[PDB]
Ligand binder design. Sequence first.
Ligand SMILES: Cc1cccc([C@H]2CC[C@H]([NH+]3CCN(c4cncc(Br)c4)CC3)CC2)c1
Ligand SMILES: Cc1cccc([C@H]2CC[C@H]([NH+]3CCN(c4cncc(Br)c4)CC3)CC2)c1
Ligand SMILES: [Ca+2]
Length: 604
Amino acid sequence: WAQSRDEQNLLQQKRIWESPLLLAAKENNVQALYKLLKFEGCEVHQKGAMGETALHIAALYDNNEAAQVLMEAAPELVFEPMTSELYEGQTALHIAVINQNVNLVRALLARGASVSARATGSVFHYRPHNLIYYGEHPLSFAACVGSEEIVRLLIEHGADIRAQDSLGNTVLHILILQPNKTFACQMYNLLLSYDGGDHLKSLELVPNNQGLTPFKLAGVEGNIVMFQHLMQKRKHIQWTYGPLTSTLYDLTEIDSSGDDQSLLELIVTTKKREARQILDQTPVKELVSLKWKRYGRPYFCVLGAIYVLYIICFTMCCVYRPLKPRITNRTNPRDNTLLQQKLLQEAYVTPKDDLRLVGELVSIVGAVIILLVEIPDIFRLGVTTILGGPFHVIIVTYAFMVLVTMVMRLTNSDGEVVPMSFALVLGWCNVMYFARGFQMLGPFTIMIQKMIFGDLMRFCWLMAVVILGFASAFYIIFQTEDPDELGHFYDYPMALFSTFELFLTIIDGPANYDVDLPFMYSITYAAFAIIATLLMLNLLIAMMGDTHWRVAHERDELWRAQVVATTVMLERKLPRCLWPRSGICGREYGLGDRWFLRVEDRQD
Ligand SMILES: Cc1cccc([C@H]2CC[C@H]([NH+]3CCN(c4cncc(Br)c4)CC3)CC2)c1
Ligand SMILES: Cc1cccc([C@H]2CC[C@H]([NH+]3CCN(c4cncc(Br)c4)CC3)CC2)c1
Ligand SMILES: [Ca+2]
């Protein structure tokens, strides 16, 4: 798609090279353009490719000596914005502020220019293909390029500090998205110097269109530099006891007060890898440790002891399935037949089956309770880098499978083990979710997750590629030999199964010492062993070897997040009689109704 602007920028320079007026304005030839405006009166209001003016060109290629003439010969071009869609709304002041041309900006204000010129051009939007996002106002441009002299001159001419963009962002919301956090921190405080001054209606309370104060946005963006610079307005010093320093934190726009207004709600839902780096700062790291030590760790282990026993009961009733003989004289049709089906669909006898019946009634409510607490979370994606994604799928597919096994219990089939088997492994594989905040196997469980999707999925595709060539060759060689003393590949499905069974050295390999096997097998099996058993398989060890310590730190950082994120989940879906709010009420004491956190440190 980028060809448009590429062609347009090429079509731009073509028309500049074509029309001799803008060619002189681009190259700043004041002696030549005077011959055009007055002698052979040139069309002054020429509109180029992007609906631009000749003044817009002199501001681009910083030629302030030529634009001085255009202001003295036509001082109304300053009010002309770019008429194209790419640069709609952009004026000559924006380019002069971006390029930081002081005497050009200082002369534009001597002739009047809209300091609120909403540059709504398409390339000014906050998009990935747009390399920067300096906002829509010339004050944001001056603050983005980091020029105090331009910022105050716009304030000296009535610039709007709290001017929101299209996305509801003020001008502070844009500074956080900038890379140069070192110098932008100075610009932020300098920009706040022109605040309304009152205790209300300040810029740090004006939220994004999506409801994000600048303090909240810094956490989602992982801008630790701008984040800690915003903490000084909120933190409170208690006393100076030598090296010690008791510090009080305003704890307001951080702790989970209401619903989505929690700051930790954004850290756990975002995908930005630098947001995981936020919960190590001096207010958050201590709080999440307190919320996890008390209340956090115990309440989770209860659900662990609750859920683990719930699966044992379901397993205890699954292992005690109904029992019936064959019922049919089909004992020999296809000698390979070996089934012994289950019993009546009613089965109203009640000796000790009433003991197994109550467990089935225990297994149905746990599934619908899961559905009654997880189906209300129909949030798109958010599942399988993410945290509790796969388990929710494991849990809701387990619950749906048992709800099928209850429908399968009646009316249909004979021994519906399809919903019995799925709801058994998933029920036990889900207890790996209750790892997480458990010291030693928390980073373990996220590592095998980061390994089942990465190196294992790389290996599984190349593994399936190999066996299909051999299993077909194995079936072909053994679609003509006896399946009674060997026949590991009697039908093509078992050919694939027995060949795949040999990729992992599970079975013993076909090798009967009473037959003259097709020597193609002896050759095909040897090449199958060298490639698959050591070259392909031992390299999986080496592939798991390198990519382990490469992520042996991000896994722990992910583990702290999934410990903190799980600590956040309980505080929401649990009531209030248990799990009280962290901190101390600001009222009664000197403050009022707010909450504060006590933290001491140690200098040197
Ligand atoms: C901490 C944590 C949270 C969520 C998931 C996990 C891992 C273990 C459980 C899951 N896997 C995959 C799904 N499932 C399965 C079962 N049978 C065959 C196949 Br393929 C797959 C169980 C194992 C996924 C990765 C860890
Ligand atoms: C099969 C297997 C299992 C586990 C590890 C390995 C090797 C991978 C490379 C690793 N070591 C250390 C990481 N890295 C390093 C080397 N020197 C100094 C510094 Br600090 C770091 C590379 C060497 C370990 C040895 C092989
Ligand atoms: Ca063996």
